[PDB]
Amino acid sequence: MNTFHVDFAPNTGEIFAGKQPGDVTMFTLTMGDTAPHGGWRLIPTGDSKGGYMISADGDYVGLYSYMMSWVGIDNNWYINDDSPKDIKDHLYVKAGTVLKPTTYKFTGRVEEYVFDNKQSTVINSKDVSGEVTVKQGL
Ligand SMILES: OC[C@H]1O[C@@H](O[C@H]2[C@H](O)[C@@H](O)[C@@H](O)O[C@@H]2CO)[C@H](O)[C@@H](O)[C@H]1O
Ligand SMILES: *S(=O)(=O)c1ccc(CCN)cc1
Ligand SMILES: [Cl-]
């Protein structure tokens, strides 16, 4: 049926090539459902496999989440959250990460799941993707 929402969006502002002075958000990810559910995961697909942005120059940059924990074993971020309230997460690069003046891509799949004793079952899912084009700095 449908109360399950997911938005995933590249960052609006300018991002400039070079060593980032601080943590810089690449992607905004917002997720909620007022239906009962036990939590969320984000699974990076294709060349993003492993939690990476891939650039047009062939470089892989690792991404980081504020709200979710990474598990390499499973190729996902996840958060157990039973709330009807929206999760506003950001995926970001860390202070000091060197970016180039190029276009960076991410693709993944978002899953919503429920626990049954006590093992998770996917109840909703949506494929997400986006890109940032980084400008010459700096
Ligand atoms: O709680 C459900 C999530 O579990 C994650 O799996 C691991 C994880 O490393 C950690 O929470 C630990 O307690 O063991 C779990 C073994 O299943 C999944 O990676 C995630 O997708 C959720 O299912
Ligand atoms: S890889 O090992 O540098 C790499 C990059 C990014 C992630 C996700 C952030 N936890 C994992 C591994
Ligand atoms: Cl992370």
For 1-138, CATH number out of 3.30.70.980, 2.60.40.3590, 3.40.50.2000, 3.40.50.300 equals 2.60.40.3590
Paired residues of 78 in beta bridges: 41, 69
Question: For residue 132, which of 30, 28, 6, 23 has the smallest C-alpha distance?
Answer: 28
Q: Which two tokens stand for residue 118?
A: 């006590």
The arrangement of strands across the sheet holding 24-32 comes to: 5-10, 24-32, 87-93, 64-65
**Residue owning the nearest CA to atom 4 of ligand 2:** 62
- Residue 46, Ramachandran bin (φ over 0: left; ψ between -120 and 50: alpha; else beta): left
- Nearest-CA neighbor of 96 among 69, 70, 64? 64
Can you name the residues that pair with 27 across neighbouring β-strands? Answer: 10, 91
* Cβ–Cβ under 8 Å, residues 76 and 38: no
Which ligand 1 atom is at minimum distance from the Cα of 74?
A: 19
CB neighbours of residue 41 within 10 Å: 22
User: Strand, helix or coil at 46?
Assistant: helix
Q: How many CB atoms lie within 10 A of CB 121?
A: 10
Query: Which ligand has its closest atom nearest to the C-alpha of 63?
Result: 2
Place of tokens 């990476």: 52
Q: Are 79 and 40 in contact (CB under 8 A)?
A: yes
The verdict on whether omega for the bond into residue 138 sits within 30 degrees of 0, i.e. cis, is: yes
Placement of tokens 């709330």 in the chain: 83
**Does the N-terminal peptide bond of residue 94 adopt cis geometry, omega within 30 degrees of 0?**
no
Strand partners, 80: 39
* Number of the ligand closest to the Cα of 37: 1
C-alpha–C-alpha distance, residues 30 and 27, integer Å = 10
> Which residues neighbour 54 within 8 Å (Cβ) at sequence distance 6 or greater?
47, 48, 60, 104, 105, 106
Q: What residues sit around ligand 3, an ion, with C-beta below 5 angstroms?
A: 64-65, 70
Domain boundaries, the chain: 1-138
In this structure, what DSSP letter does residue 17 have? S
C-alpha–C-alpha distance, residues 27 and 90, integer Å: 6
Q: How was this structure determined?
A: X-ray
| CA 7 – CA 15 distance, rounded (Å) | 21
Cβ atoms < 10 Å from Cβ of 68: 22
Three-class SS of residue 73? Answer: helix
CA of 138 to the centre of ligand 3 (A): 27
